Design a protein around this ligand. Structure first.
Ligand SMILES: Nc1ccn(C[C@@H](CO)OCP(=O)(O)O)c(=O)n1
Ligand SMILES: [Cl-]
Lengths: 102, 112
């Protein structure tokens, strides 16, 4: 059960919030307000928005002290293990992430 | 300073190139972690996503659209994962920005 403070950032285009099931000491989520259901259904008109989401993710990673490194993840469909059909960019840090990435 | 990606870009190191335009290049990963594993890289030598800037917004969006379009062309219809690694903890080993696209198998959770 999350609190309003779990929203780390918001603007006209996107929301950033903590993952209530964190896979790392820091784990948050960047989503567009426009309900793109999955990255495979993004269209060319979404180019600037998609760019903005990545920029927001990295700015927030800095704000959350992920200077020693972090991982950005976007899941698509069943094989990507996408759990909600709204676009999510995962940002994970604060521990050594492994390889392969799942 | 120049990573091995500099050779892939100038074509001195042969690669299985899936797509190219003036802004980016797409090629198969030679150490694949999935049945399909390719990389989308900018031609602009951004070393890592933490060093991208506001004027790279459009380029970053373009990289994602190219990733998704190429995923389609590779038949990743049942799904796939996009990964960007930054720095040591992210397990970044090549310091030229690149998006991994992995598909053709079930991806697990957590993502590393
Ligand atoms: N068995 C392994 C071990 C390491 N790496 C390198 C990979 C993860 O460290 O590089 C991630 P990048 O810098 O985002 O390509 C690999 O490709 N295979
Ligand atoms: Cl997800």
């Amino acid at each position: 059960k999350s609190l309003p403070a779990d929203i780390l950032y918001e603007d006209q285009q996107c929301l950033v919030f903590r993952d209530v099931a964190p896979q790392a000491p820091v784990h948050f989520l960047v989503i567009p307000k426009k309900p793109i259901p999955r990255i495979s259904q993004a269209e060319e008109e979404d180019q600037q928005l998609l760019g903005h989401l990545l920029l927001v993710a990295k700015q927030t990673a800095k704000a959350e002290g992920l200077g020693d490194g972090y991982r950005l993840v976007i899941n698509d469909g069943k094989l990507g293990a996408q759990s909600v059909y709204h676009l999510h960019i995962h940002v994970l840090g604060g521990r050594q992430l492994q390889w392969p990435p799942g």
